[PDB]
Design a binder for this molecule. Structure first.
Ligand SMILES: [Cu+2]
Ligand SMILES: [Zn+2]
Length: 259
């Protein structure tokens, strides 16, 4: 639907009126209580295969910016871990704060990171993204926390194009970007069944949240905060605090791939 956002009058506390699944049984994000998470020795190794990833474009959609990929062939896929089958990369985006002390969607023992990266993948058994989001195992989102510290060299090409997509609806060419430069050293993770974190809030997602954050510089996150939620020629509303807070865990268990 239109006109949802992150403001006081249309933010997360209002979403349930148009998207009643907002109060559902497997909503995201959640707080990850690390002491309560259980190590699962049955999980298999996570396989991230991005060598042939083919980026196309970057778009300001009014709530974040998306780096889009060619998903017409198995070029960039996620497999293993909790997943059955093959999941194809379609886009990545971030959520971030107005201040370095907030911005992530997931939290770790109630800790909020400065930002969170979401690599969005769809289950190839379902043929395309739109059919995948009608299935309870349709999507897999790999989540990576950002902390402020040293610069992330592999983020810099993304930061450098943001000036060209300041406002809602703007896009730019974004070919030949390698998303492998956004991953931490370790692929140790937590996993649980959840949902999209923005409307339509669909309950289709296997969440895979990496334990190790990546470090980005202050200057890099400051450039995220210069984007606009609004369209060109409309009153400026900085794109900041585009995160949903933690939702009730309900009848779920978070599993860890490590001890
Ligand atoms: Cu609408
Ligand atoms: Zn997201």
């Amino acid at each position: 639907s239109h006109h949802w956002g992150y403001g006081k009058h249309n933010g997360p506390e209002h979403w349930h009126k148009d998207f009643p699944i907002a109060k559902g049984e497997r909503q995201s994000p959640v707080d990850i209580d690390t002491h309560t998470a259980k190590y699962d020795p049955s999980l298999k190794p996570l396989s991230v295969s991005y060598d042939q990833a083919t980026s196309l474009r970057i778009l300001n959609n009014g709530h974040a910016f998306n780096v889009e990929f060619d998903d017409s062939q198995d070029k960039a896929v996620l497999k293993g871990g909790p997943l059955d089958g093959t999941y194809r990369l379609i886009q990545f985006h971030f959520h971030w704060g107005s201040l370095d002390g907030q911005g992530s969607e997931h939290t770790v023992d109630k800790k909020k990171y400065a930002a969170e990266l979401h690599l969005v993948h769809w289950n190839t058994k379902y043929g395309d993204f739109g059919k995948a989001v009608q299935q309870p195992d349709g999507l897999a989102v790999l989540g990576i926390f950002l902390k402020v510290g040293s610069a992330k060299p592999g983020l810099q090409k993304v930061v450098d194009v943001l000036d060209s997509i300041k406002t809602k609806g703007k896009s730019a060419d974004f070919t030949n970007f390698d998303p492998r430069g956004l991953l931490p050293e370790s692929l140790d993770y937590w996993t649980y069944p959840g949902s999209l974190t923005t409307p339509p809030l669909l309950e289709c997602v296997t969440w895979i949240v990496l334990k190790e954050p990546i470090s980005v510089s202050s200057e890099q996150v400051l450039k995220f905060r210069k984007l606009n939620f609004n369209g060109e020629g409309e009153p400026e509303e900085l794109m900041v605090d585009n995160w949903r807070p933690a939702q009730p865990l309900k009848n779920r268990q978070i599993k860890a791939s490590f001890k």
